[PDB]
Design a protein around this ligand. Structure first.
Ligand SMILES: [Zn+2]
Ligand SMILES: [Zn+2]
Ligand SMILES: [Zn+2]
Ligand SMILES: [Zn+2]
Ligand SMILES: [Zn+2]
Ligand SMILES: [Zn+2]
Ligand SMILES: [Zn+2]
Ligand SMILES: [Zn+2]
Ligand SMILES: [Zn+2]
Ligand SMILES: [Zn+2]
Ligand SMILES: [Zn+2]
Ligand SMILES: [Zn+2]
Ligand SMILES: [Zn+2]
Ligand SMILES: [Zn+2]
Ligand SMILES: [Zn+2]
Length: 386
């Protein structure tokens, strides 16, 4: 009788609260189970293997490729086209891409995350920039200048464990990452030149090449040791809460442009488990969560940005100087390639990046080795294919 909803994390307090309001509204009873992130993969596969699980599941966008192939997620194409609040035109195009496979829809975008430039407005002004850097040459130039402030002063952070960063810059320089035949092209000139460009901030001392052990407040606040970096919407909240000393001294901006300035697109979708016996009630719970005002309540309780475009007509987003920039970036942002072993490929990239920035490898030779590893990884599907 009760609609089982799987949410991911340590806590699902805010969703329980919206689920209790949904129940008061619809007479639909909802039980939210909290699945720790390090158990969700195997928990969901177990549900598939046992043809028994929740009715609605929170799906990280990068997990969609594997759970669609695994048969975990119901084809809801027909149901969402005739819905009020779940139609694909109502969501950011990149969020929509994460739901669509062989022309079919396996979920509804719920909340979206994209990566923007965080910068110290006073520090950029100091080195001659009235606005955020707008191009790769400016990001390079502004960062080298900021690094000459002092001994352990920097200009820009390249996070060596951030999976998106390499590929976001690659696409900006016109790498498609995989060609039309699915062949990896990490060793071709648009991607190789991108990695040379990222490597230049390390070699020139404008990006840290070790773990400085600074939290965001410590690195970005104060004198602004690392005065520019890239992050998601969660960092707005963190800076306001942990670095009040820099109030009115920082902003977000859209990423600097090369051929384009497009960012990554991630977050979560709501999907129906394939063997749900309550599809009707699942679709009703999902359509409530797709309503603009619920997306805005969710944003207030958890700072997750709406995937529903109409929510962005609210003043708390439209006219917020931090979040409006995430809204603009969202418009053209592109999910990381939606294949089941992307996270492995991100990881191989991480290692190659390390061999360059730390071990001084040649960029072209190292990208040749990386491209060969991706090819090998793709041939034998050791993980995540079904
Ligand atoms: Zn919470
Ligand atoms: Zn080109
Ligand atoms: Zn060093
Ligand atoms: Zn807060
Ligand atoms: Zn609430
Ligand atoms: Zn408007
Ligand atoms: Zn585009
Ligand atoms: Zn290492
Ligand atoms: Zn060379
Ligand atoms: Zn192996
Ligand atoms: Zn894995
Ligand atoms: Zn394994
Ligand atoms: Zn897997
Ligand atoms: Zn496959
Ligand atoms: Zn399987």
């Amino acid at each position: 009788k009760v609609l089982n909803v799987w949410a991911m994390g340590d806590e699902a307090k805010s969703l329980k609260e919206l689920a209790q309001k949904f129940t008061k509204d619809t007479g639909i009873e909802v039980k939210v189970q909290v699945i720790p992130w390090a158990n969700a993969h195997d928990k969901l596969l177990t549900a598939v293997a046992s043809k028994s699980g929740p009715d609605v599941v929170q799906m990280g966008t990068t997990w969609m490729p594997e759970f669609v192939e695994a048969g975990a997620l119901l084809d809801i194409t027909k149901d969402v086209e005739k819905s009020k609040n779940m139609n694909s035109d109502l969501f950011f195009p990149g969020s929509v891409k994460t739901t669509q496979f062989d022309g079919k829809t396996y979920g509804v975008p719920w909340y979206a995350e994209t990566r923007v430039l965080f910068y110290r407005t006073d520090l950029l002004k100091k080195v001659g920039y009235n606005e955020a850097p707008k191009t790769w040459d400016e990001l390079s130039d502004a960062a080298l200048k900021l690094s000459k402030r002092g001994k352990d002063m920097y200009g820009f952070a390249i996070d060596p464990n951030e999976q998106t960063t390499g590929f976001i810059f690659g696409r900006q320089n016109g790498s498609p990452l995989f060609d039309k035949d699915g062949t990896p092209v990490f060793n071709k000139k648009p991607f190789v030149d991108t990695v040379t460009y990222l490597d230049s901030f390390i070699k020139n001392g404008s990006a840290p090449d070790t773990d400085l052990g600074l939290d965001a407040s410590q690195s970005f606040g104060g004198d602004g040791i690392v005065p520019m970096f890239m992050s998601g919407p969660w960092m707005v909240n963190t800076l306001k809460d942990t670095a009040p000393d820099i109030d009115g001294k920082w902003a977000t901006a859209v990423l600097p442009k090369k051929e384009n300035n497009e960012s990554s697109l991630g977050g979560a979708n709501l999907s129906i488990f394939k063997y749900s016996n309550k599809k009707d009630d699942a679709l009703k719970f999902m359509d409530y969560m797709s309503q603009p005002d619920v997306q805005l309540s969710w944003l207030k309780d958890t700072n997750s940005m709406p995937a529903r475009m109409d929510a962005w007509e609210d003043d708390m987003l439209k006219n917020d100087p931090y979040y409006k920039v995430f809204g603009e970036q969202m418009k053209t942002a592109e999910p990381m390639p939606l294949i089941p072993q992307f996270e492995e490929i991100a990881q191989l990239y991480g290692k190659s990046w390390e061999q360059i920035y730390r071990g001084g490898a040649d960029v072209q030779t190292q990208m040749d080795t990386f491209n060969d590893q991706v090819e090998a990884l793709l041939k034998k599907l050791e993980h995540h294919h079904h």
